[PDB]
Amino acid sequence: AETPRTDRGGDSIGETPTPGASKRKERNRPLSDEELDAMFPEGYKVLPPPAGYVPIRTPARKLTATPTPLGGMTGFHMQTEMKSVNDQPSGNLPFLKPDDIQYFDKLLVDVDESEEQKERKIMKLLLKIKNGTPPMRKAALRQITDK
Amino acid sequence: RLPPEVNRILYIRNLPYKITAEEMYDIFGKYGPIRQIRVGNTPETRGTAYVVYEDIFDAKNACDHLSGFNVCNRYLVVLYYNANRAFQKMDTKKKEEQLKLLKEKYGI
Amino acid sequence: NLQAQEEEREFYNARRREHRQRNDPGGNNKEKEVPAKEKPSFELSGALLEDTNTFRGVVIKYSEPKRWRLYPFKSAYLLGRHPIDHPSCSKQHAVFQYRLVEYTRADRVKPYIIDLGSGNGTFLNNKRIEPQRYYELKEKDVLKEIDDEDEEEEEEVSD
Amino acid sequence: KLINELNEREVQLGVADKVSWHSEYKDSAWIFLGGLPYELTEGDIICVFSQYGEIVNINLVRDKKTGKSKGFCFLCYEDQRSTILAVDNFNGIKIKGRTIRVDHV
Amino acid sequence: YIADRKAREAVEMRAQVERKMAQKEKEKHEEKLREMAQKARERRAG
């Protein structure tokens, strides 16, 4: 709790810093690697591929103006011709809207049967509550009540 | 002239397990400078990645042209990544030093 | 009987009007009604990239006559000092707004250069133009008024 | 803010013209623009609201001593249908970050 | 099935042919244009 309130004080103070600066002079404000580690969930890695491709990313700003003013185009050739994809299969798994994938992606992968990760994995019964037939919603609802 | 829900972060999927960050930086590097990019190295998250740009409109042109764009045999899933959700793994702190600095250097 | 009332009135523009209506700062030189990109005007010409009309830029550093890059023009571009200006220029003599290059429609898709009234000016074929009018450019013409660290040339894509 | 929801109950229910509540007046040009930004001035608001008509004369209330706007203006057009158009149209508008309000008088 | 395999192979070969004949042309065009530009700058110097 003292930490909770400590956060609001810092929040208002940064508001006074930014607001003040304009007088002295949004969501697009540049970010820090701890702030970067703050957003994304567990289990991901940061990559450099090169130092050189990274220098391309740094020149990219300057080259977003520069290389957009330069030669470029795309074309296709006529030639004869694998196609993987995932819905939510198991037995049934009522359908996923194209956005909801972000939430339910963990259910899509078929890796199965090896603790908590299996409780989150089995907790996708939510999906059965959200979308599905009314009976699936009923039975799912009870099953999650008793659990 | 933009929908509010879109954000500088894009969730990208339908990636191979062999895929190289060279192709990543090259391809995605069209629209703007990369803030950075993460890739799942973990058993479930392998095949997924997150891209973050110095500007949103970068990402907007990206999902515009990169929509269902192709790599190898695959058509990548390109979505605007959500916010909040799982955050509090990290904390709010370390504001004191930087704020003391801006209060020191410029004196404001 | 010096100043009857201390306030009176204005009847004048407001900073938030012109501000909000043009922002990257606020900018000048809002595109005219005609402006259209050159590629789509090559599409109404029925021209694939082979026979299409694309204006490429050519650089020569004014002291030493080539490419630091090569630049396509294919509806307008903001030539300025570097962030606001799209066509950033390292030249230290360029005002924060130096000039603009707008392709416009007359009778055809034609390139145009317009000075923003940069303090120094700008030289065309080593011959300056006066501010505040669109001046058509023809191929092989040169841009740098007298502070000139660079040069520029224009080319249509052919051969 | 309440206006726009009255125009929606007027359009949704099929009010069909002359029973319109702009027929409440018929006698009045002068319009009320409140919630205006303090940087604004005569020539400006004239330039924005001459869109829907020709404004004859506007008195914007500006505090007598300090000589700055109190934040609203009473305006007068040459045409009433310009007033009907302006209240029914130009309302709920963003100016300099703040949404102005308009209504008859 | 044989006709399809050999046919695809042949058309592929013809493709790399057309591409190989194309790139040389592109570079010839860029060199030509660069020559025109250098001549233009020289005419700008004198």
From Swiss-Prot, chain A:
There is a cross-link at K45 (Glycyl lysine isopeptide (Lys-Gly) (interchain with G-Cter in SUMO1)). Phosphorylated. Phosphorylation occurs concomitantly with the splicing catalytic steps. Citrullinated by PADI4. There is a cross-link at K45, K62 (Glycyl lysine isopeptide (Lys-Gly) (interchain with G-Cter in SUMO2)). Signal peptide: none annotated. The modification Phosphoserine is found at S12, S22, S32. The modification Phosphothreonine is found at T3, T16, T18, T58, T66, T68. The record marks P98 as: Interaction with RNA. It is found in: Nucleus; Nucleus speckle. Component of the 17S U2 SnRNP complex, a ribonucleoprotein complex that contains small nuclear RNA (snRNA) U2 and a number of specific proteins. Part of the SF3B subcomplex of the 17S U2 SnRNP complex. SF3B associates with the splicing subcomplex SF3A and a 12S RNA unit to form the U2 small nuclear ribonucleoproteins complex (U2 snRNP). Within the SF3B complex, interacts directly (via HEAT domain) with SF3B3, SF3B5, SF3B6 and (via HEAT domain) with PHF5A. The SF3B subcomplex interacts with U2AF2. Identified in the spliceosome C complex. Component of the 17S U2 SnRNP complex of the spliceosome, a large ribonucleoprotein complex that removes introns from transcribed pre-mRNAs. The 17S U2 SnRNP complex (1) directly participates in early spliceosome assembly and (2) mediates recognition of the intron branch site during pre-mRNA splicing by promoting the selection of the pre-mRNA branch-site adenosine, the nucleophile for the first step of splicing. Belongs to the SF3B1 family. This is Splicing factor 3B subunit 1. It comes from Homo sapiens. The chain holds residues 311 to 522 of 1304 of the full protein.
UniProtKB/Swiss-Prot annotation, chain B:
Belongs to the SF3B6 family. This is Splicing factor 3B subunit 6. There is a cross-link at K18 (Glycyl lysine isopeptide (Lys-Gly) (interchain with G-Cter in SUMO2)). Keywords: Acetylation, Isopeptide bond, mRNA processing, mRNA splicing, Nucleus, RNA-binding, Spliceosome, Ubl conjugation. The modification N6-acetyllysine is found at K18, K30. Residues 5-18 are annotated as: Interaction with pre-mRNA branch site. It comes from Homo sapiens. Component of the 17S U2 SnRNP complex, a ribonucleoprotein complex that contains small nuclear RNA (snRNA) U2 and a number of specific proteins. Part of the SF3B subcomplex of the 17S U2 SnRNP complex. SF3B associates with the splicing subcomplex SF3A and a 12S RNA unit to form the U2 small nuclear ribonucleoproteins complex (U2 snRNP). Within the SF3B complex interacts directly with SF3B1. Component of the minor spliceosome, which splices U12-type introns. It is found in: Nucleus. Residues 8-83 form the RRM domain. One of its GO terms (molecular function) is RNA binding. Coiled coil: none annotated. GO terms for cellular component: nucleoplasm; nucleus; spliceosomal complex; U12-type spliceosomal complex; U2 snRNP; U2-type spliceosomal complex. One of its GO terms (biological process) is blastocyst formation.
Swiss-Prot record, chain C:
It is linked to Neurodevelopmental disorder with hypotonia, craniofacial abnormalities, and seizures: An autosomal recessive disease characterized by severe psychomotor retardation, intractable seizures, dysmorphic features, and a lumpy skull surface. Patients are hypotonic and have poor feeding in the neonatal period. The gene is SNIP1. It is found in: Nucleus. Residues 29-41 have a biased composition (Basic and acidic residues). It comes from Homo sapiens (Human). Degraded by the proteasome upon binding to the SMAD1/OAZ1/PSMB4 complex. Ubiquitous, with highest expression in heart and skeletal muscle. The chain holds residues 171 to 395 of 396 of the full protein. This is Smad nuclear-interacting protein 1. Residues 147-159 have a biased composition (Acidic residues). It comes from the Eukaryota. Required for pre-mRNA splicing as component of the spliceosome. As a component of the minor spliceosome, involved in the splicing of U12-type introns in pre-mRNAs. Down-regulates NF-kappa-B signaling by competing with RELA for CREBBP/EP300 binding. Involved in the microRNA (miRNA) biogenesis. May be involved in cyclin-D1/CCND1 mRNA stability through the SNARP complex which associates with both the 3'end of the CCND1 gene and its mRNA. Residues 77-129 form the FHA domain. There is a cross-link at K39 (Glycyl lysine isopeptide (Lys-Gly) (interchain with G-Cter in SUMO2)). The modification Phosphoserine is found at S158. Residues 145-159 are annotated as: Disordered. Residues 1-24 form a coiled coil.
Swiss-Prot record, chain D:
GO terms for biological process: mRNA splicing, via spliceosome; U2-type prespliceosome assembly. Residues 29-105 form the RRM domain. Its main location: nucleus. One of its GO terms (molecular function) is RNA binding. The keyword Nucleus applies. There is a cross-link at K1 (Glycyl lysine isopeptide (Lys-Gly) (interchain with G-Cter in SUMO2)). Keywords: Isopeptide bond, mRNA processing, mRNA splicing, Nucleus, Phosphoprotein, RNA-binding, Spliceosome, Ubl conjugation. It is found in: Nucleus. It comes from the Eukaryota. GO terms for cellular component: endoplasmic reticulum; nuclear membrane; nucleolus; nucleoplasm; nucleus; precatalytic spliceosome; spliceosomal complex; U2 snRNP. Part of the activated spliceosome B/catalytic step 1 spliceosome, one of the forms of the spliceosome which has a well-formed active site but still cannot catalyze the branching reaction and is composed of at least 52 proteins, the U2, U5 and U6 snRNAs and the pre-mRNA. Component of the minor spliceosome, which splices U12-type introns. Belongs to the IST3 family. Involved in pre-mRNA splicing as component of the activated spliceosome. As a component of the minor spliceosome, involved in the splicing of U12-type introns in pre-mRNAs. This is RNA-binding motif protein, X-linked 2. It comes from Homo sapiens (Human). The gene is RBMX2. The chain holds residues 8 to 112 of 322 of the full protein.
